[PDB]
Amino acid sequence: VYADSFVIRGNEVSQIAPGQTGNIADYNYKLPDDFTGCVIAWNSNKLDS
Amino acid sequence: RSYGFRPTYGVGHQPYRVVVLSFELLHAPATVCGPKKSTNLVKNKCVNF
Amino acid sequence: RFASVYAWNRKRISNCVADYSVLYNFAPFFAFKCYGVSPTKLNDLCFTN
Amino acid sequence: LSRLDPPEAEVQIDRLITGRLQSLQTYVTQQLIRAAEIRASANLAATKM
């Protein structure tokens, strides 16, 4: 079990999926086509804004 | 480059904190697992091993 | 200037290079949903209209 | 493999492989039936010879 952690835009999490397209999915963080696991995202305006 | 994460931004630009848990579902050994425990086995009984 | 949902404005594009990289580059463009094609290949494909 | 992304074209490739295997199994069955027919005809021809 591995855990990656980062902070992105709110809607940009739509690009956090196996083999998607976009700036993040191609130049920042790319998931394999056979990826299996979980992706969690939560608001951080109280901290990162 | 950065987005700025100003409070005037909406959900499209507000910062979201994301974590990606990557698991391997092979049962070769055992690293983490759920909490459960039971009794021992039987030599010549029909059991759900 | 953008028209309403009825009598929508329609423009034909031809005889030019289609650099889609500047489309998903804009920050407010959260919704980018393609049917029958992927955003990664838009810069590599050719269109007859 | 040039218009759609890998993680969404896998299902299309799988369906194409299923179709091309179903269209080939029937061909192999027809070939087996016709080979049995030709074998019977050749046995009859050898008996007559």
From Swiss-Prot, chain C:
Q: What is the effect of changing residue 1 to K?
A: In strain: Mu/B.1.621
Source organism, top-level taxon: Viruses
Q: What is the effect of changing residue 23 to I?
A: In strain: Omicron/XBB.1.5, Omicron/EG.5.1
Q: What function is annotated for this protein?
A: Attaches the virion to the cell membrane by interacting with host receptor, initiating the infection. The major receptor is host ACE2. When S2/S2' has been cleaved, binding to the receptor triggers direct fusion at the cell membrane. When S2/S2' has not been cleaved, binding to the receptor results in internalization of the virus by endocytosis using host TFRC and GRM2 and leading to fusion of the virion membrane with the host endosomal membrane. Alternatively, may use NRP1/NRP2 and integrin as entry receptors.
Q: How does it assemble?
A: Binds to host ACE2. RBD also interacts with the N-linked glycan on 'Asn-90' of ACE2. Cleavage of S generates a polybasic C-terminal sequence on S1 that binds to host Neuropilin-1 (NRP1) and Neuropilin-2 (NRP2) receptors. Interacts with host integrin alpha-5/beta-1 (ITGA5:ITGB1) and with ACE2 in complex with integrin alpha-5/beta-1 (ITGA5:ITGB1). May interact via cytoplasmic c-terminus with M protein. May interact (via N-terminus) with host bilirubin and biliverdin, thereby preventing antibody binding to the SARS-CoV-2 spike NTD via an allosteric mechanism.
Name of the molecule in the record = Spike protein S1
Tell me the gene name. S
